[PDB]
Please model this.
Amino acid sequence: ATIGRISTGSKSLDKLLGGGIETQAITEVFGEFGSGKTQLAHTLAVMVQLPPEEGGLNGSVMWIDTENTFRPERIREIAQNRGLDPDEVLKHIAYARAFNSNHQMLLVQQAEDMIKELLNTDRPVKLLIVDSLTSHFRSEYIGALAERQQKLAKHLADLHRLANLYDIAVFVTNQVQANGGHILAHSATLRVYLRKGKGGKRIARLIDGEAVFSITEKGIED
Model:
């Protein structure tokens, strides 16, 4: 399959990303608590449902939530302010809460079943969100880094396989700050560092220019 792009809703961030986040790729966004990672996830879950002329892929979404941070009312607000019907947008997001890291891993295997079911339809899965990817692994393996890395490596391998095999954009969030957190090393296809700037701005940088955007009723925008 060709590489699809999902617009982030911000022209600045899209330019930094060459058009948007890619299918057949894992995009890892990392940064401190409150940097806007979950807002970017919510925005992408709407944007992917637009037609390609507006930066979407007419896609369905699967969301794996580990911190109870998914907000249907926020999806509704973004959808309404992106010219979509909020009920339809929400119906096309399959939502699952991961109880722990082992359940999180099983949920990725379960996601493959729905991906297969929708593959030949007009609304195939095009976006798989894991928010937060690392939180359960970090809390379950305090003092056992070597074992955390083994499990994380398998989980990321599962996600890579789905992205490539089914032409999906995988979008993962990772909290990293002074008092805790670790970037996923070189495992992601693309690493994006997100941070707060002066005046409510959010700033994004690729981690081997900067994009600037705001969090608004449209999700994010320049």
The longest strand covers residues 25-31. DSSP finds seven helices and eleven strands in the chain. The radius of gyration is 16 Å. The helical segments are 11-16, 37-47, 72-80, 86-91, 101-118, 135-140, 145-166.
